[PDB]
RNA sequence: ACGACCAGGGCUACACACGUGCUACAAUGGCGCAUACAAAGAGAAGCGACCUCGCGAGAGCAAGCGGACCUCAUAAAGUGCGUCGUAGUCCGGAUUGGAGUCUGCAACUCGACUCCAUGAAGUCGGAAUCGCUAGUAAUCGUGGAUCAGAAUGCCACGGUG
RNA sequence: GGGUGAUUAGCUCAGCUGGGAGAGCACCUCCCUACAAGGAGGGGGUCGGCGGUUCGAUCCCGUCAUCACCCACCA
RNA sequence: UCCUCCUAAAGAGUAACGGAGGAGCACGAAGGUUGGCUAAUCCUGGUCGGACAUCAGGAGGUUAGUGCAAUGGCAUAAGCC
């Protein structure tokens, strides 16, 4: 139990603790289920050491675990100047993509008093 | 204690030889190692924290104690008999029984190295560390409804320069700055 | 790239941009359309961009990339 | 000259209260998988099959038919077998990141679409206001016009009760 | 100068043998028909100042500041 | 009324409706004894810890703790254990 899923429900479906975690969602969860060739319907296969933990290499070509944000957390510091539209909108909590502020902005502005 | 013969080669022996020393006493040694856990948490009802000390007693060479405070200045309205920690330190014989698996061979889930090495060292084992982020590995009675418990380590060495004593760390699962 | 491939410089700007490098002792180029594009390798030149009421002088840096003249530098304060 | 020509700009510039809508708040529901029963229209560098590349938007190669025939074109709700253990959740998806696909002088401001990650609210709505006496209140799916790119509004059509 | 009380929401005021910040009005916003009433929601607190003790003082205790009530006497 | 410091001029004695404060109890443990040990504060490193308790070291060494005001001592530790 918990050989890849980090949560205590160990008798349930192959999405539980195996999606939206450390750079893995449905599409990349399928890609390591495919790497080990195992079964997924109703429950994930009961498995031992040296069977799928050895195959994390077959899904490694993405930002994962300790590397999920590491280098972008330095690259995103590159623009900070107040005259730069991207610099200012990194230096303050603002959308670099641009949005409307007058009407239907209440998620970004948060709750009103 | 069944594992201590490695001390003649795997640690401090190349250091000993690159000064032409003849004794393990001319190079650093471990005075004491401490495995201390925190009890000062104030976010839930204090209900499962002695079984969290039993989870530490599954790897410590001495079982945790009740403990007492020394100050009563705190905003927690405590008496100086208030339990303040766990009191877990190893000297000599059962410290050779700790490195028998822990921080030496216990985890096969090694990481692709990006740079994270031992830090802030100065001249007396001046590096302190807790564990970061979850991967899960087998532990005793761990099918329990409680958050994942680790260990927070402190160590004291007979050193004067920890940068010179860097070979005392060579048998461990963690790296040192080049 | 994503906006129907390669960019285009409006001819009224393309006729006067390498004549600003290389600007002489004469005044910096005035531009009235903020819609005009600049290319990322452009550097070391001063230009004057219209905002609707004023003309704003700007020097082009190595940190300025392929912008429009409304994005590259603040032509109005404005709020 | 507030006339008229000429070029750039403005009409989603922001502060606060909405009128009418909409995905919903979970199980009169989702997730997975198979599957029944349609009308009305559009089609002269059109509609574009079969197949293929690309994670994908889209694009390549070229039949069929100038169109009761071919092509847009796998109706959905419903129906059958598994699953969820009622909790802001396997729910839900504003966000957040890196790069594309398509169009147009024009996409900062101010467009439509996509891939893999990534993430917060929402718990049936205060006084009150509105709809129907039956194919009626409610609800599911397909087209068309304007038109370079862009509607959830407009106009037709079929399903369930 | 002195005695006795007060100090908390804009106003009127609870909480006073040790922490839990609150009620009715008022204001703003909203519902009905023109103005109220009636019914909901919301904003905002050096809880006056300095010390004593205590983990902690709107609270207890001493002492300031500002206001009310009664005094400031013999010649 | 009982206590600390000054008032007080370095003997002894000592005044003031002289100047600053505490006490009205507390602990059978906070007493007895043998044996052992060494705190604060700051900094660096351990955060799942919400001003202050807390783990290791460097600097320091009755500056912390010593039941109370205040005075003074305490490593021989009267300190904590």
XYZ file of C-alpha atoms (C1' of nucleotides) in Angstrom:
687
model
C 0.000 0.000 0.000
C 1.003 3.647 -0.767
C 3.835 2.547 -3.141
C 3.026 5.556 -5.433
C -0.177 7.100 -3.944
C 0.656 9.302 -0.916
C -2.833 9.039 0.767
C -4.372 6.366 3.141
C -7.312 5.205 0.825
C -5.499 2.162 -0.643
C -8.567 -0.032 -1.564
C -10.072 2.371 -4.221
C -9.944 3.445 -7.917
C -6.730 4.098 -9.961
C -7.196 7.956 -9.948
C -7.073 8.310 -6.111
C -3.695 9.783 -4.968
C -2.489 9.095 -8.578
C -3.828 12.326 -10.241
C -3.141 16.062 -9.744
C 0.116 15.340 -7.796
C 3.871 16.269 -8.263
C 3.499 17.076 -12.036
C 1.079 14.132 -12.839
C -2.603 14.259 -13.949
C -4.868 11.817 -15.922
C -2.761 11.902 -19.148
C 0.639 11.305 -17.393
C -0.939 8.873 -14.844
C -2.042 6.774 -17.873
C 1.525 7.086 -19.261
C 3.142 5.311 -16.207
C 0.254 2.764 -15.953
C 1.194 2.075 -19.603
C 4.958 1.930 -18.748
C 4.382 -0.873 -16.156
C 1.643 -2.576 -18.335
C -0.639 -3.138 -15.226
C -4.483 -3.118 -14.682
C -6.578 -0.076 -13.645
C -10.367 -0.968 -13.757
C -12.254 -0.580 -10.404
C -8.828 -0.841 -8.558
C -5.112 -0.486 -9.365
C -3.083 -3.753 -9.393
C -1.623 -4.892 -6.037
C 2.128 -4.362 -6.599
C 5.554 -4.773 -4.873
C 8.967 -3.001 -4.808
C 11.024 -3.017 -8.094
C 7.941 -3.118 -10.482
C 6.854 0.537 -11.160
C 9.213 2.626 -8.933
C 11.940 1.428 -11.391
C 9.913 2.864 -14.366
C 9.617 6.552 -13.274
C 12.282 7.065 -16.012
C 9.546 6.375 -18.705
C 7.567 9.531 -17.724
C 10.543 11.737 -16.655
C 10.408 14.315 -19.566
C 8.369 16.908 -17.638
C 8.697 19.219 -14.571
C 8.253 16.760 -11.639
C 8.578 16.320 -7.848
C 11.507 18.532 -6.556
C 11.826 20.060 -10.110
C 8.081 21.018 -10.555
C 8.812 24.821 -10.099
C 12.613 24.981 -9.272
C 14.132 26.742 -12.334
C 11.060 28.868 -13.245
C 11.140 30.238 -9.635
C 14.444 31.911 -10.777
C 13.606 32.564 -14.505
C 10.395 34.435 -13.511
C 12.626 36.955 -11.585
C 14.200 38.140 -14.926
C 11.679 41.001 -15.518
C 11.033 43.445 -12.638
C 11.313 47.007 -14.159
C 8.299 49.321 -13.515
C 8.301 50.586 -17.172
C 8.034 47.018 -18.485
C 4.369 45.812 -18.776
C 5.501 42.226 -17.918
C 7.974 43.501 -15.231
C 5.372 45.561 -13.356
C 2.749 42.734 -13.709
C 5.221 40.253 -12.156
C 6.315 42.716 -9.386
C 2.607 43.252 -8.401
C -0.226 40.658 -8.343
C -1.656 41.562 -11.813
C -2.529 39.525 -14.978
C 0.250 39.854 -17.644
C -2.428 38.575 -20.138
C -4.668 41.576 -19.275
C -8.301 41.404 -17.987
C -11.301 43.788 -17.486
C -11.519 45.578 -14.054
C -14.864 47.523 -14.202
C -17.375 44.573 -14.423
C -17.078 40.828 -13.684
C -13.671 41.210 -11.931
C -14.919 40.016 -8.478
C -12.695 36.858 -8.280
C -9.473 38.894 -8.775
C -10.660 41.780 -6.547
C -12.011 39.183 -4.042
C -15.140 39.617 -1.858
C -16.865 43.028 -1.578
C -17.811 44.573 1.774
C 25.978 -3.296 18.041
C 26.836 -5.227 14.813
C 28.074 -2.479 12.404
C 31.159 -0.346 13.327
C 34.154 -1.935 11.482
C 33.695 0.488 8.478
C 35.222 3.353 10.568
C 38.782 2.298 9.466
C 38.175 3.156 5.743
C 34.740 4.620 4.743
C 35.089 7.743 6.984
C 38.056 10.027 8.014
C 40.788 7.530 6.821
C 41.750 9.531 3.677
C 41.746 12.691 5.855
C 44.001 10.846 8.386
C 46.345 9.793 5.534
C 46.502 13.285 3.832
C 48.040 14.562 7.137
C 50.056 11.339 7.914
C 48.129 10.896 11.235
C 48.186 7.502 13.108
C 45.158 7.816 15.484
C 41.362 8.259 15.042
C 41.886 10.887 17.802
C 43.843 13.283 15.443
C 40.590 13.681 13.356
C 36.950 14.571 14.333
C 34.537 12.155 16.138
C 30.816 12.341 17.112
C 30.319 13.454 20.737
C 26.483 13.030 20.718
C 23.529 12.876 18.251
C 20.016 14.090 19.171
C 16.743 13.111 17.399
C 14.481 15.694 19.061
C 10.726 15.956 18.132
C 8.519 19.009 18.730
C 5.447 18.994 21.054
C 4.783 22.796 20.984
C 2.090 22.378 18.226
C -1.203 24.272 18.849
C -3.561 23.589 15.870
C -5.472 20.421 17.021
C -6.512 18.628 20.273
C -3.455 16.942 21.943
C -4.625 13.292 21.608
C -2.179 11.180 19.510
C 1.257 12.709 20.378
C 2.609 9.939 22.733
C 1.913 7.436 19.925
C 3.927 9.908 17.752
C 6.727 9.451 20.367
C 6.188 5.650 20.016
C 6.693 6.187 16.227
C 10.075 7.853 17.122
C 10.871 4.988 19.582
C 10.698 2.652 16.521
C 14.027 4.206 15.231
C 15.650 5.776 18.370
C 18.146 3.703 20.473
C 16.499 5.141 23.640
C 12.710 5.594 24.148
C 11.417 9.194 24.655
C 10.820 10.548 28.173
C 7.982 12.681 29.614
C 10.206 15.875 29.896
C 9.745 19.188 31.765
C 10.017 22.911 30.906
C 12.354 25.489 32.587
C 10.545 28.813 31.822
C 6.855 29.567 32.608
C 6.858 32.973 30.775
C 4.816 31.522 27.865
C 1.348 32.613 26.613
C 0.339 28.892 26.937
C -0.122 29.342 30.780
C 2.278 26.461 31.563
C 3.812 25.180 34.843
C 7.566 24.274 34.900
C 6.550 20.540 35.047
C 4.866 20.965 31.568
C 6.062 18.344 28.996
C 8.276 20.366 26.554
C 9.806 17.708 24.250
C 10.987 14.085 24.136
C 14.663 13.887 25.465
C 16.328 11.545 22.898
C 20.161 11.585 22.623
C 22.557 8.765 21.652
C 26.198 8.256 22.829
C 28.491 5.334 21.926
C 26.956 1.861 21.572
C 23.341 2.487 20.303
C 24.544 5.298 17.974
C 26.360 2.553 16.008
C 22.882 0.829 16.021
C 21.233 3.997 14.549
C 23.534 4.418 11.487
C 22.960 0.633 11.018
C 20.088 1.692 8.607
C 18.948 5.288 9.258
C 20.596 8.019 7.097
C 22.900 5.317 5.543
C 20.841 2.690 3.563
C 17.121 2.753 4.659
C 15.611 4.483 1.508
C 15.948 3.124 -2.096
C 14.011 6.200 -3.469
C 17.135 8.258 -4.271
C 16.676 11.550 -6.215
C 18.310 12.904 -9.370
C 20.824 15.334 -7.824
C 20.248 19.049 -8.592
C 22.613 20.523 -5.901
C 20.999 20.016 -2.421
C 23.914 19.338 -0.007
C 24.809 19.766 3.704
C 24.965 23.492 4.629
C 26.054 26.184 7.150
C 28.862 24.081 8.773
C 31.587 25.891 10.869
C 33.607 23.826 13.474
C 31.340 21.637 15.793
C 28.955 19.690 13.472
C 27.105 22.946 12.683
C 24.348 21.544 10.397
C 20.718 20.912 11.568
C 17.955 19.261 9.463
C 14.313 18.121 9.430
C 12.757 16.171 6.510
C 10.981 17.916 3.571
C 8.016 16.865 1.368
C 6.213 13.469 1.115
C 7.067 10.239 -0.787
C 5.851 7.525 1.735
C 7.814 4.402 2.780
C 6.954 1.385 5.080
C 6.777 2.145 8.850
C 5.345 0.396 11.996
C 1.515 0.489 12.536
C 1.452 3.302 9.883
C -2.072 2.398 8.523
C -3.213 5.043 11.079
C -5.227 8.288 10.794
C -2.360 10.698 11.625
C -0.050 13.006 9.563
C 3.253 11.556 8.271
C 5.962 11.752 10.990
C 9.708 12.188 10.305
C 12.803 13.226 12.314
C 14.631 16.492 13.149
C 18.384 15.870 13.731
C 21.076 17.750 15.719
C 24.726 16.585 16.137
C 27.900 17.618 18.060
C 31.447 16.703 16.885
C 35.006 17.031 18.348
C 35.863 19.375 15.409
C 37.427 22.848 15.014
C 36.668 23.233 11.234
C 33.685 21.253 9.833
C 34.883 21.964 6.231
C 38.112 20.056 7.126
C 36.138 17.244 8.917
C 33.912 16.727 5.755
C 34.891 13.011 5.569
C 32.992 12.181 8.824
C 29.794 12.497 6.644
C 30.921 10.196 3.781
C 28.970 6.994 4.769
C 25.577 8.822 4.768
C 22.649 9.050 2.284
C 23.110 12.882 1.891
C 25.912 14.827 0.012
C 28.400 17.604 0.982
C 29.156 20.884 -0.923
C 32.109 20.566 -3.341
C 4.728 33.550 -34.361
C 1.189 32.741 -33.001
C -0.359 35.857 -34.712
C -0.247 34.674 -38.357
C 3.592 34.188 -38.359
C 6.269 36.923 -38.904
C 5.667 40.555 -37.788
C 5.580 43.676 -40.056
C 6.884 47.228 -39.500
C 4.622 49.989 -40.875
C 6.424 51.686 -43.816
C 6.394 55.171 -42.200
C 8.509 53.681 -39.330
C 10.672 51.319 -41.446
C 11.811 54.380 -43.548
C 13.100 56.193 -40.364
C 14.382 53.516 -37.834
C 18.001 52.861 -39.056
C 18.188 56.689 -39.432
C 17.839 56.918 -35.589
C 20.905 54.765 -34.634
C 22.860 56.964 -36.051
C 20.450 59.849 -35.173
C 22.931 62.793 -35.628
C 22.664 66.056 -33.632
C 19.006 66.373 -34.857
C 15.845 65.633 -32.812
C 14.649 62.036 -32.121
C 11.997 60.576 -34.479
C 8.337 61.394 -33.647
C 5.770 58.570 -34.096
C 1.959 59.026 -33.830
C 0.711 55.378 -33.999
C 1.183 53.211 -30.833
C 0.095 50.233 -33.040
C 3.579 50.047 -34.685
C 5.834 47.042 -33.936
C 9.565 47.059 -32.978
C 11.999 44.139 -33.486
C 13.988 42.568 -30.568
C 17.547 43.226 -31.945
C 16.916 47.047 -32.044
C 19.070 48.892 -29.417
C 20.793 52.205 -28.500
C 18.217 54.521 -30.224
C 15.936 57.233 -28.793
C 12.368 57.697 -30.214
C 9.407 59.954 -29.284
C 5.947 58.219 -29.095
C 2.634 60.153 -29.139
C 0.002 59.226 -26.490
C -2.957 61.479 -27.636
C -1.755 64.741 -25.989
C 2.060 64.481 -25.413
C 5.131 62.897 -27.056
C 7.156 60.624 -24.721
C 10.947 60.139 -25.404
C 12.161 56.513 -24.848
C 15.602 54.851 -25.202
C 15.544 51.230 -26.519
C 17.388 48.700 -24.239
C 18.661 45.095 -24.502
C 15.752 44.135 -22.152
C 13.098 45.481 -24.618
C 12.032 42.716 -27.055
C 9.555 42.515 -30.025
C 6.890 44.922 -28.611
C 4.224 47.341 -29.868
C 4.914 51.038 -29.094
C 2.019 50.884 -26.513
C 3.676 48.004 -24.476
C 7.494 48.660 -24.534
C 7.436 51.690 -22.171
C 4.711 53.634 -20.291
C 3.342 56.322 -22.719
C 0.763 57.375 -20.038
C 0.766 57.188 -16.192
C -2.355 56.741 -16.697
C -5.077 56.076 -14.048
C -16.624 76.827 -38.976
C -19.560 72.503 -34.743
C -19.334 72.316 -42.833
C -16.198 68.780 -45.754
C -11.545 66.343 -46.951
C -6.689 63.664 -44.610
C -4.177 60.466 -40.908
C -3.970 58.506 -36.241
C -7.341 57.675 -32.184
C -12.136 56.431 -28.950
C -16.740 53.185 -28.744
C -14.525 46.062 -23.551
C -10.960 53.538 -20.784
C -13.117 52.330 -13.422
C -14.663 53.146 -8.597
C -20.114 50.962 -7.254
C -25.504 49.215 -7.456
C -27.601 46.125 -10.840
C -32.018 44.439 -15.061
C -32.019 40.029 -17.829
C -29.044 35.399 -18.684
C -25.548 30.927 -17.492
C -22.021 26.564 -15.660
C -23.588 25.179 -10.809
C -23.908 24.476 -5.536
C -24.039 17.887 -6.119
C -26.551 11.594 -6.386
C -34.303 14.845 -9.479
C -26.007 14.234 -10.080
C -21.148 12.896 -11.841
C -17.017 9.514 -13.610
C -16.099 5.137 -16.946
C -17.922 2.122 -20.977
C -21.464 0.501 -24.828
C -26.023 2.036 -27.146
C -31.671 3.306 -29.551
C -35.143 6.789 -31.699
C -34.650 12.850 -35.863
C -36.370 17.405 -38.695
C -34.943 21.693 -40.913
C -31.102 24.029 -43.575
C -25.991 25.212 -45.877
C -22.823 23.567 -49.962
C -19.317 27.108 -57.801
C -10.758 28.709 -54.893
C -18.040 25.241 -52.193
C -19.570 20.942 -48.436
C -15.208 18.082 -48.402
C -15.230 11.510 -47.319
C -11.481 7.503 -46.705
C -6.651 7.993 -44.764
C -2.386 10.657 -42.288
C 0.767 14.294 -39.478
C 0.636 17.136 -35.007
C -0.267 15.850 -27.645
C -4.066 19.472 -29.992
C -6.468 23.801 -32.108
C -5.629 22.752 -37.112
C -3.580 21.016 -41.354
C -1.939 17.573 -45.514
C -3.473 14.033 -49.547
C -7.548 13.642 -52.615
C -12.773 10.611 -53.615
C -18.238 11.729 -53.766
C -21.849 15.517 -55.310
C -23.321 20.609 -57.555
C -26.247 18.017 -54.778
C -34.496 14.096 -52.221
C -28.684 10.575 -53.831
C -22.468 12.880 -51.932
C -20.486 15.730 -48.157
C -21.332 19.460 -43.138
C -23.437 14.511 -40.239
C -21.274 9.175 -34.369
C -28.600 13.630 -32.039
C -28.682 14.271 -26.563
C -31.743 13.695 -22.604
C -32.950 8.530 -22.388
C -31.364 2.899 -21.839
C -27.812 -1.213 -19.782
C -23.302 -2.623 -16.407
C -19.618 -0.809 -12.873
C -18.313 3.096 -9.419
C -18.922 7.618 -5.498
C -20.314 6.431 1.069
C -22.738 12.924 1.541
C -17.630 15.665 2.701
C -16.185 22.053 -0.291
C -15.759 15.864 -2.010
C -13.227 10.753 -7.001
C -17.278 17.076 -6.725
C -16.576 21.769 -8.828
C -12.812 24.806 -11.967
C -12.570 31.596 -11.430
C -6.684 30.730 -11.436
C -1.527 29.847 -12.521
C 2.703 28.530 -15.920
C 5.226 27.326 -20.663
C 4.370 26.917 -25.896
C 1.175 26.516 -30.150
C -3.149 26.462 -34.033
C -6.560 30.087 -37.019
C -7.896 35.147 -38.910
C -7.294 40.203 -39.833
C -3.261 46.678 -41.745
C -4.656 45.815 -36.494
C -5.418 40.472 -30.937
C -0.289 46.068 -25.670
C -5.177 48.056 -24.692
C -9.270 44.815 -27.230
C -10.294 38.119 -30.759
C -11.763 32.468 -31.213
C -9.448 27.623 -30.276
C -5.621 23.887 -27.928
C -1.932 20.561 -25.016
C 0.318 19.194 -20.074
C 0.464 20.803 -15.439
C -1.782 24.008 -11.589
C -5.685 26.124 -8.128
C -9.870 29.313 -4.983
C -15.098 29.995 -4.354
C -19.911 27.489 -4.657
C -23.577 24.176 0.748
C -30.577 25.997 -2.913
C -30.279 32.220 -2.046
C -32.900 38.535 2.949
C -37.829 41.342 2.313
C -39.995 40.238 -2.168
C -40.735 39.388 -7.517
C -42.330 36.179 -11.811
C -44.885 31.237 -14.883
C -48.760 27.290 -16.543
C -54.245 25.305 -16.002
C -51.699 20.024 -20.388
C -48.189 18.968 -25.075
C -48.778 23.886 -20.084
C -44.605 25.692 -16.382
C -39.933 22.572 -16.941
C -35.891 20.156 -20.208
C -32.394 17.619 -24.344
C -30.031 17.901 -29.258
C -29.308 20.049 -34.938
C -29.099 24.008 -38.396
C -29.317 29.220 -40.523
C -28.446 34.760 -41.095
C -25.055 39.023 -40.377
C -19.619 37.668 -41.409
C -12.086 38.247 -42.548
C -11.833 36.498 -37.065
C -15.524 36.650 -33.374
C -22.383 35.123 -30.092
C -24.576 32.044 -24.736
C -28.722 37.509 -28.503
C -31.832 36.773 -33.422
C -34.714 33.135 -36.900
C -36.032 27.959 -37.872
C -36.432 22.513 -36.521
C -36.769 17.741 -33.990
C -36.693 14.639 -29.049
C -38.954 13.884 -23.445
C -42.929 15.065 -19.917
C -7.031 72.855 45.182
C -10.740 68.590 47.347
C -14.621 64.705 47.252
C -17.898 61.321 44.190
C -18.815 59.270 39.403
C -17.709 58.436 33.866
C -14.312 56.555 30.129
C -16.112 50.314 24.960
C -19.276 51.425 17.784
C -21.439 58.203 15.378
C -25.528 58.058 19.602
C -27.555 55.643 24.033
C -25.060 51.885 26.904
C -24.016 46.085 28.752
C -19.864 42.947 29.639
C -16.662 44.503 36.340
C -14.237 37.565 42.532
C -9.161 37.536 35.132
C -9.011 36.210 27.759
C -14.513 34.565 25.150
C -15.789 42.387 22.164
C -21.788 42.910 22.188
C -27.365 44.968 22.143
C -31.079 48.867 20.328
C -30.828 53.130 17.462
C -27.914 55.695 13.649
C -25.428 55.323 8.576
C -24.880 52.575 3.947
C -27.082 48.799 0.718
C -31.597 46.175 -0.462
C -37.287 44.573 -0.617
C -42.895 47.368 -1.011
C -45.854 52.254 -2.981
C -44.503 58.699 -2.688
C -42.391 59.559 2.399
C -41.898 56.710 6.554
C -42.983 52.251 9.109
C -42.102 46.937 8.452
C -38.127 42.905 7.221
C -32.815 41.539 6.123
C -27.750 42.351 5.335
C -23.170 45.155 6.005
C -19.229 48.638 7.567
C -16.021 50.170 11.743
C -13.615 49.491 17.589
C -5.668 52.658 20.717
C -12.370 48.986 24.996
C -8.758 56.974 27.020
C -3.072 57.121 29.059
C 1.229 55.015 32.332
C 2.445 51.539 35.783
C 1.461 47.110 39.609
C 0.370 41.786 39.595
C -0.556 37.776 36.130
C 0.680 33.837 30.618
C -2.926 37.712 29.808
C -5.995 43.721 32.671
C -12.006 46.373 28.872
C -12.119 43.804 34.448
C -8.491 44.153 40.031
C -5.176 47.974 42.293
C -2.377 52.878 42.327
C -1.911 57.186 39.198
C -2.691 60.568 35.053
C -6.107 63.082 31.285
C -11.181 65.101 30.075
C -16.397 66.009 31.513
C -20.707 66.191 35.197
C -22.478 66.725 40.427
C -21.250 68.804 45.333
C -17.370 71.839 47.784
C -13.082 75.211 48.354
C -14.942 76.974 55.075
C -11.385 80.900 59.915
C -10.175 86.621 58.904
C 1.982 48.337 62.353
C 6.248 45.071 60.130
C 10.492 45.176 56.226
C 14.414 47.157 52.033
C 17.262 51.958 50.245
C 18.650 56.904 51.118
C 17.904 60.939 54.419
C 23.220 60.699 57.959
C 28.333 64.973 57.567
C 32.833 57.086 56.576
C 33.050 55.982 64.872
C 28.700 55.372 68.169
C 23.777 57.696 68.685
C 19.995 60.086 65.366
C 15.355 64.166 63.658
C 11.681 65.826 60.160
C 3.053 66.043 58.062
C 11.642 63.941 55.018
C 12.142 61.455 49.904
C 10.969 56.252 46.682
C 8.525 51.145 47.451
C 6.742 46.477 49.528
C 4.155 43.407 53.238
C -1.292 41.554 55.829
C 1.308 35.788 53.641
C 3.396 31.601 51.053
C 5.574 26.584 50.761
C 4.755 19.930 54.099
C 6.569 21.559 49.543
C 9.429 25.918 47.773
C 12.001 21.772 54.313
C 16.180 17.726 55.422
C 20.561 14.989 53.122
C 24.055 12.302 49.633
C 25.561 12.381 44.675
C 25.575 15.136 39.979
C 25.123 19.449 36.763
C 25.222 24.487 34.697
C 21.438 29.754 33.018
C 19.933 34.563 30.297
C 20.427 37.307 25.774
C 22.115 37.545 20.755
C 23.601 34.984 16.333
C 23.803 30.479 12.695
C 21.189 25.984 11.636
C 16.460 22.708 12.700
C 9.121 25.443 11.339
C 3.692 21.223 10.505
C 4.598 26.438 15.957
C -0.557 30.965 15.425
C 4.842 38.035 20.148
C 7.181 34.876 24.576
C 8.030 27.776 26.436
C 11.244 24.407 23.016
C 16.668 20.761 19.850
C 22.640 21.525 18.647
C 26.566 24.824 18.415
C 29.439 29.842 18.430
C 29.715 34.388 21.602
C 28.946 34.845 27.090
C 29.229 33.219 32.113
C 25.678 33.906 39.842
C 23.859 39.794 33.395
C 19.665 33.788 34.223
C 17.681 31.533 38.394
C 17.424 32.795 43.629
C 8.690 33.368 46.393
C 7.605 38.629 47.093
C 9.703 45.087 47.615
C 14.603 46.739 47.931
C 19.722 45.775 49.298
C 23.541 42.285 48.719
C 25.639 37.788 48.174
C 25.420 32.916 46.034
C 30.055 28.132 40.990
C 31.625 25.664 47.935
C 26.909 27.121 43.691
C 21.317 28.856 48.694
C 20.631 28.092 41.243
C 18.250 22.968 38.675
C 18.440 17.957 38.703
